[model samples]
Target: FQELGLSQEVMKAIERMGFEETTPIQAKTIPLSLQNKDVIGQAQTGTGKTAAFGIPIVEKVDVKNGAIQALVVAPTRELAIQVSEELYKIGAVKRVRVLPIYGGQDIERQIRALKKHPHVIVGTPGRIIDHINRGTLRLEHVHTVVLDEADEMLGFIEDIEAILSHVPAERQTLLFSATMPDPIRRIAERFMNEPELVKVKAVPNIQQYYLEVHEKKKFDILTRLLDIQAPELAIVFGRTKRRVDELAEALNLRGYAAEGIHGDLSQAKRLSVLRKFKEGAIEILVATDVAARGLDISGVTHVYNFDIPQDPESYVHRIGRTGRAGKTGVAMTFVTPREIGQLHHIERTTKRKMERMKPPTLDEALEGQQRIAIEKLLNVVETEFYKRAAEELLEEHDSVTIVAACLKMLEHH
Candidate 1:
């Protein structure tokens, strides 16, 4: 803290937060920002970016002026609230007030709160512009502007530009994005000053894909998919408990290791199923949204949404089960032609487009099964029984016949 030239108050807050060392994002952005330089950051979420900008904002806050000194534009209401909370924590010792304004809440109430002369305003673009047009939010006193989650907010560049037009051009500008799409890159160039780039490469937490199939062919298509995927441990999420039950029974009848858990299940049975899934007793655990949210199981290689989620937040929660702890995982959502609109809505809301999957043919499924079997054999080919018993039978039985028998006994599908 002392080495970074931060104030005693900022250092005290940092100490209280128990951060003895700075994260990469914080370490790089903070120094450049303190020098009053514009910064463009490319980093994964949860990389302590809030503090990187938060500390500099707090460091520059003129509490005696009683005006909005800094601004942060976020993509969603939930994200705005989170940024506000973290800013408040960081700026606490400096006696700087932080306010988050978003569209869903009452505008009159937000206006009333704005009369309190907050030092920092973290807001969604629409609501912030509302306050600005209503003559409530003053940008004359504002200097620092942060574009948080630029990639997600790329859909609303006009509103972002409108807000920027009101703020002074000479102030420090910071743009942080998870990915650098063309639109975001153009916008960054338009608004930033000779910005220093700070990129943080972190392991991905989600690998997503989607299957487009009609309702009638879903069962056969999904069955074929299960054989091809043949996950070590997986979750199958259906929209309802009845749907979950149907999938569980149907998958099991097709010789898949599956069990269903939903609201109707007893506590003991749910625990037992989860334990089995966690311990790799089941390849597929069919479940509904309510049951899976309560599940804490990890090491999941895949998540299959038997039906597309009704909302984006639910989809986020469902897919979060996989791609954890620096290990990649897959989440596949099933979409019917009728529900394609709903899927697009989810994509727009989440700012991530799902890849349209090419359904595996029966031959393709067979090929995948053969590939998996060979890979598994290769993994443990040095086992004690790695042809020791087969060698014994080699003199008495044909070599090709023995190998064929071994493959039949091994995992094929």
Candidate 2:
């Protein structure tokens, strides 16, 4: 936290948002960025990276005479909006107005907002290109340009090329993503000026496992394992937002406290659901990769991969949310028989072997319940009130009979 060049008000905003320390990415990227050096940060998602670059960009922008001094290019509209919101919060005290321009919304509305002269613009590649081509977005005086999720943007190289052609040639460029594919590297080499690289290594205590489930039985097996393990806080990741919503609804029908978050949700609803989960009002959160990006949550004991992610790098980001804070954590990934090949791809990328695990049986669930019961009983015995209860019970019944009754009650649970 000390390493990042944050002002007192920005630090207050960060603390209010529940971050006491910097992640590995933040610690390395923030200081170098503050020096006005271009940077390429390769880190998994959920690593508090938005602020890593946002802080420097916001600090440099002249809020009083704003003319689009900083620009952030994101892959998806959802990410563009999310990044804008986070930047707005960090720059609120500075009166830096951050605007998001994307494909789905009205272009004329953006043009009208552009007339207001916002300090920062967060936009998707395609839409940014559209605005630039239409002469609606001018970057002659722009000092900084950021490519957030550069890997995803590079995946669609044509769009990225068209978008980059319009930006100012001498601006400071910062690229951040989970992976550095060859295309993304080429972009960094061609566009950036002696960019420094910052990479983060995975923690060692996470127990990663993979299981081959038939496509038809994937949900059933996931529910069974959840019942057996009974994780206090878990996240179930699906490929799409719609899938996340359906999975959450199904899990809720089965008596699990669950909710889903996705791109389609309004900003207010997304924050509301996240707050509830952070406060322990919900046990499980179902989300897609896009929706979960930049999320900062703690106490997540487990992560379940409902569908194999499209890329191996995304898998690493999904599971990296757990196994933090020097505590052991669990991660279970469900792979279809046909997708066993994908599991190998993820293992190769992460450089970590995943152990194979068998599905839990109904008896195992019952045994897990009994273990919880015993733990609860032992907790009561260790408490001060248990001494008076023991004395009262001894006076009413034989000692052996009372112990037998307690055991029976525990066993029934």
Candidate 3:
């Protein structure tokens, strides 16, 4: 961070926020962004991409001038709120006002807030366009513009184009996306000056594997695997919205706390589902490709590709959901007989073959359940309350019979 030549206020804020070192994306992108150069950073979420662009935006803000100097457009309302909060912390010392605007909120209240004149605005495309069309927001003085999660915002390309048309062409544009498709490329070519492209490598320390099974038996295999693995937190990726919905419902019916999130859900529902997943209110999250991009939650021990992606790039993004913050993770993919060719294609693209895993049997799953019950019993064995109960039980029965009965009870529970 010091090598990036950031101002003292920004440096103080960085230390205050407990950020000791920069990630790979931060190390490369910060310097370029600080130089007032247009940068198209190619990186996934949870890789400190926020801080990469955030630090430069904070450093360059003139708190005294306060004319909406920087504008950051994110895809989801949740992302808009998260990015605004981070920028607020980064610009704390400079006392910069960072505002987040999105739909699902009272527009009149937002209009009143806009009258306060924030120096930086983080918002979604729809609401940003709404404010612009109503003449309630102006960006003539915005010298820096950021399109965050550009690939995820592909559906809003026309809105993005309209938003960009409002901003000055002489400004520095920083676009960040996990995957760059042709449409995003065209946007960059049309809107940005010769932008420097910074691409980060794939995440490390993820154990990738695949299990071969029939299409109809996938759900059973998944439940058995979950029973054996007993993941602390898991994410299952499906191919379509209906697949995610059906899988989530089926998992719940089979006695697992699960939920689904997709584009079809309302913004409020999607945000609540994500919050529940993060708060541990739900143990498993079933999702579509929407969750594959830009949603960063810690402590995801495993990722299940219930349905393999057609695009190999999506495979990379799916597994990247885990293995964050240098922590180890496991990724298990389910492949059918007809999908072997696609699996091989993914292997070639990722430059690593997934180890084939044997399917766990029902007896193995039952044994796993018993093992977990035994562990639970052991944890409570050191407590004193069980001693009296044990003494009474031992008085009436043989020790071997008493122990076996207790094990059975624990297994049943």
Candidate 4:
């Protein structure tokens, strides 16, 4: 927080929110950005880059004089909404109002809200361009412009170019994304001025593994693995809304607590599922790439790939749910034999090799249960909670009989 140039009030909010240390992306980019330098941050989705740039953007805004000082463009409506919510929380101390502009809603309503003049605007490329052409969203007074998920914008370069033409020529630009493709590099070369490049390496404590299964048998294998591993909290990635629904239902039928979220679900249902996941009522969540984008969930011990992602970038975002903030996590990918080629593509892109794991046999699973039983027994003895029970047992029976009783109790577990 000190390195980010955050005010005392913001620091208090950070502490209250239970963030004690900075993420790697935050630690590096915050200091450089606070110095008023343009930055290109190469980081995965869950690396806290939102706060990395959001702090500097908030600090630069003039809350007293209401105007559009900051513009953040994301790829999808869901991401835009999620980003705006986080910005609102971070700026809560300073009472800064952050508005989200996107399609699939009323434009006249947005125009009425624009009358109040939000200091910061987070939006998707299409809606931002539409508002720009309508002369309703003005960037003349904007001093800072951010391109969140720059690679995705580059994929839609035509829309990005149309949007960029309207912004001022001398604004502080910040670009952040998981990958630095050639097109993204070209954009920085053409538009940015001597931007600082920052890249965060994946933490070593994250264990990456993969399993080879037939495409038709993917759901059954996933359910079996969940039963064997029993992750405390997990995210299962699906390619589409249909896949998400099927996977979630399969998990539920297998006696696991699970739910599905996608663009098809109502906004209220989406928020309700997220709230339930946070409160620990739901242990497993199935979602599409776009629906799960920009979510910040803690205590996720496992991540499963029901289908190998179509691209390497999507794979990074999917598995990133686990292994965050110095916590040890396990990520498993289910790939068909034909999709083994995709696994190599991901490995080459991420510049890391994934270990291949054979499926666990039923005998191995029973051994795992026995190991857990032993751990639980040792914990009771270590805490010295069995002393009184041992004394009473010794008074009535032989040592061998008392040991047999303890083992019998453990067998039930």
* Shift in Å, residue 341, candidate 4: 7.5
Q: Least accurate stretch of 10 residues (summed lDDT) in model 3?
A: 308-317
Kindly list the per-residue Cα lDDT of model 3 for residues 76-118, writing each as its tens digit.
6656755786787788888888888887667887899888999
State the lDDT of candidate 2 residue by residue for 312-352, as single tens digits.
54566678778767899899999888888868877886788
lDDT of each: 0.80, 0.80, 0.85, 0.79
Show pairs that collide, candidate 1. none
Candidate 2, clashing residue pairs?
Answer: none
lDDT of 1 by residue, 1-413 (tens): 33699998888876766667888999999999999999988886567776888899999998898988899998765466556766776777878898878765678878888889999999889888888898988898789999987776863788899999999878999998867899977876888888899999852567788998877777777777777887778888876556788989988987889999864566478779889988888888888654444255677888888888754545776787887777888889889988899789878867788888987787887777677778877887556253576677897989889777877766443
Worst 10 residues of 1 by lDDT: 288-297
RMSD of 1: 11.3
- Give model 3 RMSD, 1 decimal: 7.9
The C-alpha local distance difference test score for the whole of candidate 4 amounts to 0.79
Clashing residue pairs in candidate 4 are: none
Pick by TM-score: which candidate is best?
A: 2
**By TM-score, highest first, what's the ranking?**
2, 4, 3, 1
> What ranges in model 3 sit over 4 Å off?
16-32, 42-48, 65-67, 103-117, 178-182, 194-371, 378-389, 396-413
TM-score of every model versus the real structure: 0.54, 0.66, 0.58, 0.60
